[PDB]
Symmetry: C2
Subunit: 257 residues, 2 copies
Amino acid sequence: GMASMRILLSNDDGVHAPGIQTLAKALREFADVQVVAPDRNRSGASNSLTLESSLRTFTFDNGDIAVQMGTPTDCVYLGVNALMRPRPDIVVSGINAGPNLGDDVIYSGTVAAAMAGRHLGFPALAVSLNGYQHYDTAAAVTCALLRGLSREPLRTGRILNVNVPDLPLAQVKGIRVTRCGSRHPADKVIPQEDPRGNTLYWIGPPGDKYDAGPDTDFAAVDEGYVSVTPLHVDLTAASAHDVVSDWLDSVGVGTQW
Amino acid sequence: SHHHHHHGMASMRILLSNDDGVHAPGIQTLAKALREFADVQVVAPDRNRSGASNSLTLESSLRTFTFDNGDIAVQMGTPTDCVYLGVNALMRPRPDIVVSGINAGPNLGDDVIYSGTVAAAMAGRHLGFPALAVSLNGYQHYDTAAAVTCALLRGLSREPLRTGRILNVNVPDLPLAQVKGIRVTRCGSRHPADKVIPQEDPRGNTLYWIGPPGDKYDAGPDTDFAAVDEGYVSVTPLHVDLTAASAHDVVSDWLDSVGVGTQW
Ligand SMILES: [Ca+2]
Ligand SMILES: [Mg+2]
């Protein structure tokens, strides 16, 4: 093998998470792996980053780095820019306990850390397990993808979102390239009074599946396939361009006539 | 019947938020303009949360605080938490639309996915009018961004907009008379940001600041960058679907070719 793969490994659940430790161990059988991940398991970071403050890092004995109060984006950013020299070949984010599917992906810290590694020599991988049990399955799927990538370059697509059925490896049917499904709007709030009678509010669960058709990430994982969706960060909705332009003309906004 | 710039002093119910927080000049100038013709409820972060993007608070309940004028701050709340709570719990009657802004500084190109301004608008995408994110390319002409947003909202009152759930609006930092018009744009892109600014704490530990955005990369003629640089309001319709559809076949052929997850 002419060259070792050098991986920057991060996650949404922090350095202590079973998912990131299991992955790290499996990748280290063939690759050099630097962990740079949050100091703890926080929920709901998405792609936020810390701009109002500087960040502290801590290095463990095994060389793992925790960024203190770091988001997953902050971790990949420091890792790519300042803490690994030279820069990593690729960012791998995972294994996340829990699926990152459909229109949820924009809110996922696991996806966020991969999107921060989109400009490296390989497409970044975000790896989520549809459950909490078969980390070994997700780790073997990840190793298989990475072997694929060093065998033949993937030409287009800077981020792959990978969702792994929570199944023993022998039961996973295969791998499908998918698009993101969608959900109905989330609408539940759960109010709870504090001891003084003040109402506080919890964000409720996601809305029901809407677009879960045959070509979606939801469908593939349901049928026991690995789902691979390529993602990009361009939010432009190009199909709306003519409608919006026509509308502006019609209501006279930006025209005198 | 009577000739005024706007018909109705409260003809639409607006949930107004931002990521700069309730005390920011951009949201306070926008609130004051909007209240001339709309029924406005501010629900915004208790402080500046630039950097919050689409993050939300899941492992903790949120507490709200209501100011004398009725503005609501969500304590520790992100822009997404503010809109989600405003819409689903706090407002009665529910809003017809979410407006988020005016942000101090632009939200252009591939930065839009990192913007808390944009995230609040995207949490309002399911309402009857498309949500607006409004950002000023500068810090001076909040007045100009407010006039532009009021023009869009009067427009929505004349005629509903059919497709496009979220409009990302960037306004040049110019007097209104100097703004050239409006273009419907696409997001351009930047080089990766690459700077990390170290700074020692008083005990001699090294702390790190995230550096500024990378250089412009794709600022083509129909980009939001180009529009604003040329003195035009940029309007880009946005969606939340991250699927790189134009990569599907290539990824699919690559898989078949390396045979990952196949037997043979
Ligand atoms: Ca801001
Ligand atoms: Mg997680």
